[PDB]
Amino acid sequence: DTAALLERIRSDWARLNHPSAGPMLTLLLLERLHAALGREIERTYAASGLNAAGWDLLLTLYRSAPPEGLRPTELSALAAISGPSTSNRIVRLLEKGLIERREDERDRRSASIRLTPQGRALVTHLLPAHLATTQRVLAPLSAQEQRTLEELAGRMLAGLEQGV
Amino acid sequence: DTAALLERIRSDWARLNHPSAGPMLTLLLLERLHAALGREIERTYAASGLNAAGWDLLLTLYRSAPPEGLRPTELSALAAISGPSTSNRIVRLLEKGLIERREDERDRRSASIRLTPQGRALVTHLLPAHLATTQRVLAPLSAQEQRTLEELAGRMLAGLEQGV
Numbered sequence: 601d602t603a604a605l606l607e608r609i610r611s612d613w614a615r616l617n618h619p620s621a622g623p624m625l626t627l628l629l630l631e632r633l634h635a636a637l638g639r640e641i642e643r644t645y646a647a648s649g650l651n652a653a654g655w656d657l658l659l660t661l662y663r664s665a666p667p668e669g670l671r672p673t674e675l676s677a678l679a680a681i682s683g684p685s686t687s688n689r690i691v692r693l694l695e696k697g698l699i700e701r702r703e704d705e706r707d708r709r710s711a712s713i714r715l716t717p718q719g720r721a722l723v724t725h726l727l728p729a730h731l732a733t734t735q736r737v738l739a740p741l742s743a744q745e746q747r748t749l750e751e752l753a754g755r756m757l758a759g760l761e762q763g764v
Numbered sequence: 765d766t767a768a769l770l771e772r773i774r775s776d777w778a779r780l781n782h783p784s785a786g787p788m789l790t791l792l793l794l795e796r797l798h799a800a801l802g803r804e805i806e807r808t809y810a811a812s813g814l815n816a817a818g819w820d821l822l823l824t825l826y827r828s829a830p831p832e833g834l835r836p837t838e839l840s841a842l843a844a845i846s847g848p849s850t851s852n853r854i855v856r857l858l859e860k861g862l863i864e865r866r867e868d869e870r871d872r873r874s875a876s877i878r879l880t881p882q883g884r885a886l887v888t889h890l891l892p893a894h895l896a897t898t899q900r901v902l903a904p905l906s907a908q909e910q911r912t913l914e915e916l917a918g919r920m921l922a923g924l925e926q927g928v
């Protein structure tokens with residue numbers, strides 16, 4: 601695609617006025633930014649048989665798990681992606697031998713999840729290209745445009761993170 | 765969730781330095797912003813039996829279809845969402861009687877898609893609450909923070925929209 605047709609869509613909206621179209625354009629862009637980021641990011645881990653939910657989970661453990669693991673609760677909390685893509689992510693990666701349980705359904709209610717030796721090797725091997733992609737993708741803004749986006753994104757998510 | 769644990773994740777990353785964590789935080793936020801927006805937006809159309817792919821398609825036609833329809837090509841191009849969620853969106857909404865074909869596989873290669881009378885009624889009825897949500901969700905930034913986000917988002921998507 602181009603952003604050649606942003607002006608088409610802006611005027612399409614404008615025909616709906618029998619009071620500006622920036623909100624609907626802004627979200628359009630974000631949707632599309634999201635998709636685009638998706639494609640760019642999956643380049644790192646696709647060769648390796650993972651969807652994004654899988655990778656995200658692994659990487660959460662890598663950066664944020666103490667040695668005994670995270671409960672899926674606090675996993676949820678520290679991960680990037682928590683939707684319905686995350687339905688079968690745990691049970692999938694258990695199959696793959698990338699994560700393990702720690703105390704199944706015995707003495708302590710629900711179990712805690714950590715990286716297996718191969719899980720860890722994977723992430724470490726991908727990590728550099730993952731940060732590469734992460735850096736590259738943001739490279740078209742200057743830093744501090746990067747930090748200003750950081751702020752604004754934060755701020756909206758903030759205002760959203762309270763329920764009706 | 766809170767953005768209470770942004771600082772946890774920032775320090776988790778920082779432990780990976782045996783050169784800042786803003787890029788990975790920024791994308792984290794966007795993922796999460798995306799999910800959050802998703803939940804907020806679906807409030808308009810869920811009662812009405814539509815996923816987001818369905819709604820997005822309908823709304824594209826509503827704002828951007830000429831009276832004879834869009835070819836799925838230029839549909840793709842003007843819509844917000846083009847991923848694998850869009851796999852069975854057309855064929856679903858055809859079932860539902862919300863969109864129609866115009867000349868099937870006769871004289872002119874591929875067919876063109878438009879809103880049915882009920883399709884249109886739906887959108888018109890939802891539209892106000894859809895723009896409401898669109899406005900509300902952005903309300904925590906001032907305008908011109910809204911336009912600065914518009915720019916930055918545009919700019920990144922731009923830099924991304926060229927292939928390797």
Ligand SMILES: O=c1[nH]c(=O)c2[nH]c(=O)[nH]c2[nH]1
Nearest residue numbers: 624625627628631819820844
């Ligand atoms: O992800 C989105 N879905 C939509 O249906 C929509 N509509 C809109 O104006 N912006 C967006 N963004």
Ligand SMILES: O=c1[nH]c(=O)c2[nH]c(=O)[nH]c2[nH]1
Nearest residue numbers: 655656680788789791792795
């Ligand atoms: O959507 C994302 N997925 C990730 O796996 C990831 N990793 C990251 O640092 N930011 C993001 N964003």
Ligand SMILES: [Cl-]
Nearest residue numbers: 624628823844
């Ligand atoms: Cl739209």
Ligand SMILES: [Cl-]
Nearest residue numbers: 659680788792
């Ligand atoms: Cl991450």
